[PDB]
Enzyme design. Sequence first.
Site, PDB file in Angstrom:
ATOM      1  N   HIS B  41       0.798  -1.216   0.000  1.00 24.30           N
ATOM      2  CA  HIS B  41       0.000   0.000   0.000  1.00 24.30           C
ATOM      3  C   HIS B  41       0.844   1.286   0.000  1.00 24.30           C
ATOM      4  O   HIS B  41       0.338   2.388  -0.242  1.00 24.30           O
ATOM      5  CB  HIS B  41      -1.013  -0.031   1.168  1.00 24.30           C
ATOM      6  N   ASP B  89      -0.582  -7.404   1.662  1.00 18.91           N
ATOM      7  CA  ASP B  89       0.085  -6.067   1.703  1.00 18.91           C
ATOM      8  C   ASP B  89       1.579  -6.208   1.867  1.00 18.91           C
ATOM      9  O   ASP B  89       2.139  -6.073   2.990  1.00 18.91           O
ATOM     10  CB  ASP B  89      -0.545  -5.228   2.842  1.00 18.91           C
ATOM     11  N   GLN B 182       0.322   5.431  11.498  1.00 15.13           N
ATOM     12  CA  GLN B 182       0.572   5.970  10.144  1.00 15.13           C
ATOM     13  C   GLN B 182       2.044   6.305   9.953  1.00 15.13           C
ATOM     14  O   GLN B 182       2.657   6.827  10.850  1.00 15.13           O
ATOM     15  CB  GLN B 182      -0.235   7.253   9.911  1.00 15.13           C
ATOM     16  N   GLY B 183       2.575   5.987   8.785  1.00 10.64           N
ATOM     17  CA  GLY B 183       3.968   6.258   8.458  1.00 10.64           C
ATOM     18  C   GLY B 183       4.851   5.065   8.777  1.00 10.64           C
ATOM     19  O   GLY B 183       5.980   5.016   8.246  1.00 10.64           O
ATOM     20  N   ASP B 184       4.369   4.134   9.613  1.00  8.63           N
ATOM     21  CA  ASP B 184       5.185   2.955   9.968  1.00  8.63           C
ATOM     22  C   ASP B 184       5.011   1.810   8.961  1.00  8.63           C
ATOM     23  O   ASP B 184       5.830   0.856   8.960  1.00  8.63           O
ATOM     24  CB  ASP B 184       4.841   2.401  11.359  1.00  8.63           C
ATOM     25  N   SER B 185       3.977   1.870   8.125  1.00 10.29           N
ATOM     26  CA  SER B 185       3.713   0.816   7.158  1.00 10.29           C
ATOM     27  C   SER B 185       4.946   0.390   6.371  1.00 10.29           C
ATOM     28  O   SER B 185       5.772   1.235   5.956  1.00 10.29           O
ATOM     29  CB  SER B 185       2.653   1.236   6.139  1.00 10.29           C
TER      30      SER B 185
END
Lengths: 59, 235
Positions: B41, B89, B182-185
Amino acid sequence: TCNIKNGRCEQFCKNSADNKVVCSCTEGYRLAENQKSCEPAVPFPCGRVSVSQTSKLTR
Amino acid sequence: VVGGEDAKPGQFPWQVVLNGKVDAFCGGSIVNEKWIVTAAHCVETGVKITVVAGEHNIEETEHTEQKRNVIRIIPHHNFNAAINTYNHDIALLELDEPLVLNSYVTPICIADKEYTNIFLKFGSGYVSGWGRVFHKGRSALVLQYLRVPLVDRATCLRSTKFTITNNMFCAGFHEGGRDSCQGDSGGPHVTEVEGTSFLTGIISWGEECAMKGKYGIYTKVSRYVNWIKEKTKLT
Ligand SMILES: [Ca+2]
């Protein structure tokens, strides 16, 4: 018998030769002399922190 | 990462940050000198992406940083087969020039399917990244890390209206307060096995972050190790 404590394999264990076993390691490591442990076979093997020795110890 | 702590430089040498149309927008882990594994993603055709390995503090220079351009992106072939499910993902990024391995730039180990699942079931793993440190708050400047416990699938299912597939697992705390965000994906969920860390999951999705009764959802890497090994071969 990989059944108990992973057959005493530091990394991977596979059954072999009638209730026996054979330990293996991931890329960059090699099956130590004692057939269970894994030792680095390259300068920077995967998964290990090598910065260490902070800056205050015996070393 | 919410509720985590500052990593020491070189503590997670396989961690990389991805930069693009948005800076520090996702994480990734080094597979080898030419390949990074991340979340699909994060790299849905959007921009050109740059990878920075050996990174610690996003606003400072440590002189350990290695920046590389991504020349090829391989999202898992079944990602987006179904709309908005976040199933599969995971994605691979090929770098233009090889990373130079050293104490700050080191790959993460990847076991076969059986052992990756054995390690995940150890029940405790580490997540890291430069993502939000508070739900809807600022991103981190210094790499953060957090230990998260594996959550039983029935509890996982009961925590959300959204579908949790066999290619996912839940990890986090029943009381909340600590979670990826958020941002750690794309960053790794890793399990240390006697001093050697192995990749057990990819930070993937959630509902807000660190809320009581909710858990972080992670891509189950054991289901993809064969694919990672096939696509990242060096010649
Ligand atoms: Ca820096």
